[PDB]
Amino acid sequence: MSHHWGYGKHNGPEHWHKDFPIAKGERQSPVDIDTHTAKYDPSLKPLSVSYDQATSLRILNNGHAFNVEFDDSQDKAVLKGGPLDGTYRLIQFHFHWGSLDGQGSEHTVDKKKYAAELHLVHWNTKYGDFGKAVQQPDGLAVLGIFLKVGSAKPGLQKVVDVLDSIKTKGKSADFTNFDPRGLLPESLDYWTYPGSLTTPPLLECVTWIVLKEPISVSSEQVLKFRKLNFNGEGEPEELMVDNWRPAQPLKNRQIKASFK
Ligand SMILES: [Zn+2]
């Protein structure tokens, strides 16, 4: 039901729903947006992004995606807007990329749909424990930045350069002195909705902040993301693409967008 295609089991995993008792509730997908099904929220205090002090450490490929870890022993990469439930520091981020240039980003706004997206994960520091944040509806906060193909993104070059060295899962690479400022789009608009299974356990600990301004990346850049593998080294070649699940009906998604 409601699953003609699912990332995992071809027509949607049944065992998943029966393995997680919490399936008693309603949530599968992180978000699903419609211009009509989205409610604007007042010009409350914007999201203060302070990651000029962000210190990247390492980049790692773990089968389903490739993550770059930042240090948060101090308030290096900080994100907090007005009324919220904590300060969410940046710990890592990864990119989404669909096999076809007209899919992959997810978070489809009525008719939207992009080939790629940048997903930055922030963790609520006031509980001093990432797993504790996972056990909280507001425990995490993530930034979703759509990627559109066209003009090249000079700031993206850094990660594109190292993609070939993180091709297969299991291997790691040093990735220090990275600045996320080079990833900034033009307009800073966003949607804000708590997301589901965007985490190991089937729960809604994530707060999705999806930017309405997609960044411009070039074909040469996006093509190199398609060079990554799900497999490890010395394993049957598979291309790290899509890695996303179809969006869900009003059966537990209603969108809000807090901006002037
Ligand atoms: Zn993601």
From Swiss-Prot:
Domain Alpha-carbonic anhydrase: 3-259
Result of changing residue 121 to K/R: Strongly reduced CO(2) hydrase and p-nitrophenyl acetate esterase activities
Cofactor binding remark: Zinc. Can also use cobalt(II) with lower efficiency, but not copper(II), nickel(II) and manganese(II).
Pfam families tied to this protein: Carb_anhydrase (PF00194)
Activity versus pH, per record: Optimum pH is 6-8.
Positions marked as site (Involved in the binding of some activators, including histamine and L-histidine): 92
Stated consequence of mutating residue 64 to A: Reduced CO(2) hydrase activity, rescued by 4-methylimidazole (4-MI). Reduced proton transfer. Enhanced proton transfer. Enhanced proton transfer capacity
Similarity section: Belongs to the alpha-carbonic anhydrase family.
More info: Target of drugs used in treatments against glaucoma disorder and breast cancer.
Reported disease: Osteopetrosis, autosomal recessive 3: A rare genetic disease characterized by abnormally dense bone, due to defective resorption of immature bone. Osteopetrosis occurs in two forms: a severe autosomal recessive form occurring in utero, infancy, or childhood, and a benign autosomal dominant form occurring in adolescence or adulthood. Recessive osteopetrosis commonly manifests in early infancy with macrocephaly, feeding difficulties, evolving blindness and deafness, bone marrow failure, severe anemia, and hepatosplenomegaly.
Protein role: Catalyzes the reversible hydration of carbon dioxide. Can also hydrate cyanamide to urea. Stimulates the chloride-bicarbonate exchange activity of SLC26A6. Essential for bone resorption and osteoclast differentiation. Involved in the regulation of fluid secretion into the anterior chamber of the eye. Contributes to intracellular pH regulation in the duodenal upper villous epithelium during proton-coupled peptide absorption.
Protein name per its UniProtKB record: Carbonic anhydrase 2
Organism per entry: Homo sapiens (Human)
Taxonomic lineage of the native organism: Eukaryota, Metazoa, Chordata, Craniata, Vertebrata
Gene giving rise to this polypeptide: CA2
